Amino acid sequence: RMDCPALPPGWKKEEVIRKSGLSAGKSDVYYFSPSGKKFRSKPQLARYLGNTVDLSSFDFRTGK
Amino acid sequence: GEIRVGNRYQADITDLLKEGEEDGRDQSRLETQVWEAHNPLTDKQIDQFLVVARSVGTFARALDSLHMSAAAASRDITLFHAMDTLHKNIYDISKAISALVPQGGPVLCRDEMEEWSASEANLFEEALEKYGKDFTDIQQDFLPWKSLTSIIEYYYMWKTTDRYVQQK
Amino acid sequence: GEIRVGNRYQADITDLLKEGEEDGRDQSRLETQVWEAHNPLTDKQIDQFLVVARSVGTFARALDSLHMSAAAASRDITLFHAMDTLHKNIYDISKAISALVPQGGPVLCRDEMEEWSASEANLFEEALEKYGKDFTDIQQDFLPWKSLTSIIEYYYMWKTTDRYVQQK
Amino acid sequence: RRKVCYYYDGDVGNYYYGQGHPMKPHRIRMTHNLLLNYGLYRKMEIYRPHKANAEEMTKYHSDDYIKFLRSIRPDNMSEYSKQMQRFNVGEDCPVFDGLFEFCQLSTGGSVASAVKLNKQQTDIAVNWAGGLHHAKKSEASGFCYVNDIVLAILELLKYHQRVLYIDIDIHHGDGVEEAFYTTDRVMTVSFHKYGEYFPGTGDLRDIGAGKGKYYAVNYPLRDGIDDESYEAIFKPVMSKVMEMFQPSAVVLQCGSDSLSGDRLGCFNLTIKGHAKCVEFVKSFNLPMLMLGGGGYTIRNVARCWTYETAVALDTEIPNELPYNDYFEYFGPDFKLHISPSNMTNQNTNEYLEKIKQRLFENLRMLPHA
Amino acid sequence: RRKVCYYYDGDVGNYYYGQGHPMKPHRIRMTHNLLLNYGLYRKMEIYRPHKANAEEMTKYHSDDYIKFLRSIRPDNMSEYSKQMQRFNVGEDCPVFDGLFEFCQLSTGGSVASAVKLNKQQTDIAVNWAGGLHHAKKSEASGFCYVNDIVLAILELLKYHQRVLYIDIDIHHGDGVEEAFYTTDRVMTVSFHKYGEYFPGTGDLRDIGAGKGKYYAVNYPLRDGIDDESYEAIFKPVMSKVMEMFQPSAVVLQCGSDSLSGDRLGCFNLTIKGHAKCVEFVKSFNLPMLMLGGGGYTIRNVARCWTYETAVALDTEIPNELPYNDYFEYFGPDFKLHISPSNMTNQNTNEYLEKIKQRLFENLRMLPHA
Ligand SMILES: O=P(O)(O)O[C@H]1[C@H](OP(=O)(O)O)[C@@H](OP(=O)(O)O)[C@H](OP(=O)(O)O)[C@@H](OP(=O)(O)O)[C@H]1OP(=O)(O)O
Ligand SMILES: O=P(O)(O)O[C@H]1[C@H](OP(=O)(O)O)[C@@H](OP(=O)(O)O)[C@H](OP(=O)(O)O)[C@@H](OP(=O)(O)O)[C@H]1OP(=O)(O)O
Ligand SMILES: [K+]
Ligand SMILES: [K+]
Ligand SMILES: [K+]
Ligand SMILES: [K+]
Ligand SMILES: [Zn+2]
Ligand SMILES: [Zn+2]
Numbered sequence A: 001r002m003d004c005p006a007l008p009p010g011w012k013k014e015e016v017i018r019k020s021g022l023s024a025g026k027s028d029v030y031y032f033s034p035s036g037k038k039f040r041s042k043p044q045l046a047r048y049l050g051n052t053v054d055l056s057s058f059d060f061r062t063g064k
Numbered sequence B, C: 001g002e003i004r005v006g007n008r009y010q011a012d013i014t015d016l017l018k019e020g021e022e023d024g025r026d027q028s029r030l031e032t033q034v035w036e037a038h039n040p041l042t043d044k045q046i047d048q049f050l051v052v053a054r055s056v057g058t059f060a061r062a063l064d065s066l067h068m069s070a071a072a073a074s075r076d077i078t079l080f081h082a083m084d085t086l087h088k089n090i091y092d093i094s095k096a097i098s099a100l101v102p103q104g105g106p107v108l109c110r111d112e113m114e115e116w117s118a119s120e121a122n123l124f125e126e127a128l129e130k131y132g133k134d135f136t137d138i139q140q141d142f143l144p145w146k147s148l149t150s151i152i153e154y155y156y157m158w159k160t161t162d163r164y165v166q167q168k
Numbered sequence D, E: 001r002r003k004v005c006y007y008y009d010g011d012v013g014n015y016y017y018g019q020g021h022p023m024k025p026h027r028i029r030m031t032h033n034l035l036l037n038y039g040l041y042r043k044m045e046i047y048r049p050h051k052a053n054a055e056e057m058t059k060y061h062s063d064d065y066i067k068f069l070r071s072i073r074p075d076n077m078s079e080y081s082k083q084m085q086r087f088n089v090g091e092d093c094p095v096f097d098g099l100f101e102f103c104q105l106s107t108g109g110s111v112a113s114a115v116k117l118n119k120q121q122t123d124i125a126v127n128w129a130g131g132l133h134h135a136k137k138s139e140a141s142g143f144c145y146v147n148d149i150v151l152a153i154l155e156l157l158k159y160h161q162r163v164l165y166i167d168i169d170i171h172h173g174d175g176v177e178e179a180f181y182t183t184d185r186v187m188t189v190s191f192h193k194y195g196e197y198f199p200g201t202g203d204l205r206d207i208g209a210g211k212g213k214y215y216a217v218n219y220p221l222r223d224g225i226d227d228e229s230y231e232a233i234f235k236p237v238m239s240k241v242m243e244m245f246q247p248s249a250v251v252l253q254c255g256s257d258s259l260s261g262d263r264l265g266c267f268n269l270t271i272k273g274h275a276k277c278v279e280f281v282k283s284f285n286l287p288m289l290m291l292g293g294g295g296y297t298i299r300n301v302a303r304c305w306t307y308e309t310a311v312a313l314d315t316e317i318p319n320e321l322p323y324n325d326y327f328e329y330f331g332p333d334f335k336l337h338i339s340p341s342n343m344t345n346q347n348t349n350e351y352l353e354k355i356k357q358r359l360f361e362n363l364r365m366l367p368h369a
Helices: A042-052 B043-062 B066-073 B076-088 B093-100 B118-131 B135-141 B148-158 C043-062 C066-073 C076-088 C093-100 C118-131 C135-141 C148-158 D026-037 D063-071 D077-086 D099-118 D148-156 D174-179 D227-245 D271-283 D298-312 D349-364 E026-037 E063-071 E077-086 E099-118 E148-156 E174-179 E227-245 E271-283 E298-312 E349-364
Strands: A012-017 A027-032 B031-035 C031-035 D004-007 D045-049 D124-127 D163-167 D186-193 D216-221 D249-253 D288-291 E004-007 E045-049 E124-127 E163-167 E186-193 E216-221 E249-253 E288-291
Touching: A012 B118, B031 B076, B043 B066, B043 B076, B043 B093, B043 C043, B043 C066, B043 C093, B066 C043, B066 C066, B076 B093, B076 D026, B093 C043, B093 C093, B118 B135, B118 B148, B135 B148, B148 D026, C031 C076, C043 C066, C043 C076, C043 C093, C076 C093, C076 E026, C118 C135, C118 C148, C135 C148, C148 E026, D004 D099, D004 D298, D026 D298, D045 D099, D063 D077, D063 D099, D099 D124, D099 D148, D099 D288, D124 D298, D148 D163, D148 D174, D148 D249, D148 D288, D163 D227, D174 D186, D186 D227, D216 D227, D216 D349, D227 D271, D227 D349, D249 D271, D271 D288, D271 D298, D288 D298, E004 E099, E004 E298, E026 E298, E045 E099, E063 E077, E063 E099, E099 E124, E099 E148, E099 E288, E124 E298, E148 E163, E148 E174, E148 E249, E148 E288, E163 E227, E174 E186, E186 E227, E216 E227, E216 E349, E227 E271, E227 E349, E249 E271, E271 E288, E271 E298, E288 E298
Parallel strands: D004 D045, D004 D124, D124 D288, D163 D186, D163 D249, D186 D216, D249 D288, E004 E045, E004 E124, E124 E288, E163 E186, E163 E249, E186 E216, E249 E288
Antiparallel strands: A012 A027, B031 D045, C031 E045
């Protein structure tokens, strides 16, 4: 769980490698709120944050 | 998509110095030279020295795989070090060669690629395949004793690895 | 067990030359110098050059086992060649190093030990174990394409072989 | 044959913008390394640039913008977020470890070289790290944090009455433009894509203001421009520019995202065409300061600036790439040059000549005899 | 410190006497190689001797003895057998491929060096190949085919009135003795085993003849002589010799078969003791010409002449043998020095003093003031 400096304080990003199946070796990216709530996509994260951040130019995968 | 005007946008334009005025800029605080282009040496001699710098390097790593050590010694870091050794010694071949064998002993230059341990290399291939290209977390969780910027230098060198085949 | 007297035993004694007479002896027909003992070089520099001469040699045989090639390059033939390269180039380190890397390419010196093929080496160990130390017959019947004197030089070098254990 | 000074700090390839980010400083290290193996390194004066301190960065920027940069880290990233938004540091300009170090090297290279040019002890000076042209006085923008170009130019003005700034980068050089928008001493010429593209500025009608009116030249362009079309509109315009603006020092930003097959760019230029511009400029025998800039297919960025360095040394190099630490990066081919794509050039002759003429009028407004 | 000239031809180690034969030229190559690795090579003037031609070998030998040698081969070995018997070439002096080449190198080394001494451009000159002292005018003997020593001496007589010849070899130096038996210009001193030993000559009563009477000194000895006994009888006698014979050039044959544990020899000398003689001679600061000679435990032959070369350079060397191509030859120890054996010294003080006195009388017969 890495701090994501471009999100507000306490937000973290984690990348997880798939271990088996059709997409073995590909990864999934997750974000965690300061309280530890887990988010799995850009629109889910944007819905949660609302107007407190502008995510138009935010690259969900890299966190930049 | 708009260009702005005002004190908070434009730069204050620096006035041309008088014929008597001097810019007052200390050049040693700004640069330090690493290779003069007008040398008493010829291409052949520099080329030759580079071969020698490579040979020492191979013989160095023979003193604690032949082709491997030679290739290792032929990498750029060794060459760059060879071009500095020349310049530091004022392009005196005879003096510069002493530099390479200080006290009868040769010198070793190893880039992060070659320098890392087998197990560090291993750690890296686990951290990448697990955290992708997130190099601060790759250090924090996998190689915390290494400095970020060494992990970067390693990354790029590793991308050319032979055993490395992400393409098909 | 007897010492003899007469014209057919004693030498005719060579008369001392007059202060005006000259011995008339062409020194180039008698000797050719291979190392001057009073050099502008210091022990350190010669030592250093020898290391370099060794490194080139190892890097040479890397271009068509690491420790093996280094030891190979550290043998006396390479060193002797290094001391001549110095003297031929008038003890100019910078000039002498060019000699070692003529056109960007290194030089290889291999003694008969290293130079022989696996199968020639094999032939030799059959010829010895079969004809003992009779080196003209060893050539005639086993290595007839080699010159006797190369087989001798090889013999002695081979006597120090590791895999060679005649003692217990 | 012109004397060239090359500025490089080994650390610059190792600073990293962030996962998924297109700007990759490593491309300069790739160039550096090719230059050594193509034997060009040998032939020019190689300088390590000392770090530029806040002292000289504030010669243009805010005392509290640089202060912010000197201070900010990924540690205190959630503490500063207030100031982060005021200064544009985020979505496409990340914070990242070493950021301020990176800026110091890029700026040091450009400044040191400017001095070198003013001190009249070089003809050409090259700093591929530099060229970061989107930066503003009080905010970062388009991957640029410090505008090394402005600072460089500001030093040149100390000895040069008129400084010409040429910008090949596919993106409009709005940082260097805005900084000099109201002055007649510096003329900013820029050739770039326009229309649904960053930074949204630099159309035909962007001419300058005040004393700086008729001193900001722009050439807006659509997709797919050839070497042939580009050459046929660069030489005419630049010869007029020299003719009219009569500068005494040139600063050519050699942005490599105007090449074909760029990740972000959508132009169809080859290294050859791209370089023809550098060669044309060099021909005007003025103190010249080559900087880099954009470029996001780094294999080609490497190729380009390696080639364009040769051009400054007017030495030939083979298409055969020399072996190097990153040799394996260069495709199955391992060649220096790239060829153009089947991509369609939407810059019809009619559209280029309309614009050309409008610019020729603008340039005629300057004083001459 | 004295200047030294060293003569060596790489080929000399490679000539071979024959299966089962004790004389092994390879021992010179072993020395050569140690000298290089002990760093001594470095410190002296190294010369390759050109081949001595029949021209200068016949300056002492028969025009038809050398002719025979130049001609003989192992091919025409059964054709010549007539002449083979007249010239002693067989049982212990084999024919072998390169034989005449071997002689030319041994003789070339000694002659070249003699010249070098006469030309006054060295103080000491060393040729380990040489020293082959059993040869006669018209026949080979005791492994010696050409007497390089005589030829060497004959050249020295051109500039030196009195030439002293000292012979340490365990075998009596009858070749050099017989060649100069009737002259007063050359004094031949020899210390050797006697009694059921080769060459059967050189007892107490062997004094010379004619003008050469009282100019051939000999010291006959039994088995097992120490360094201590040898030293105590060499220095006294040689100081008298110098005192009386007052020479102007010395030729020291440094036969190494007088060392302990030789294959053919039966003396109990160490390298140290053996060398003490070379050092003592050198001390008399005369133009000096060191030759080798016998020696048949080649590991020690190598050691000896390596050490004795150091002595001529008055430089120290460690007991630690340096690595070399033949390093593995030197036992489990790999040391330079040898120690004496438990072997019993049958040279009682009474027997040595009897002889000593007889020689002191002989030497007193020379002219002096
Ligand atoms: O290592 P990075 O700096 O993150 O860049 C890599 C790299 O691109 P470069 O080689 O031009 O640096 C990959 O190229 P290869 O390693 O495959 O040669 C590329 O893969 P593709 O070239 O196949 O696109 C990949 O892109 P992606 O992440 O889309 O697979 C991209 O990473 P970034 O996209 O994060 O820059
Ligand atoms: O190779 P060669 O010139 O014929 O000499 C060898 C050799 O003696 P050197 O090493 O002193 O030359 C042997 O020694 P190693 O190879 O065993 O070390 C020795 O064997 P010993 O030392 O065990 O006697 C052997 O003698 P022999 O043939 O009696 O076994 C002897 O050969 P020659 O006797 O023919 O000289
Ligand atoms: K542009
Ligand atoms: K302007
Ligand atoms: K004797
Ligand atoms: K005599
Ligand atoms: Zn751009
Ligand atoms: Zn003897």
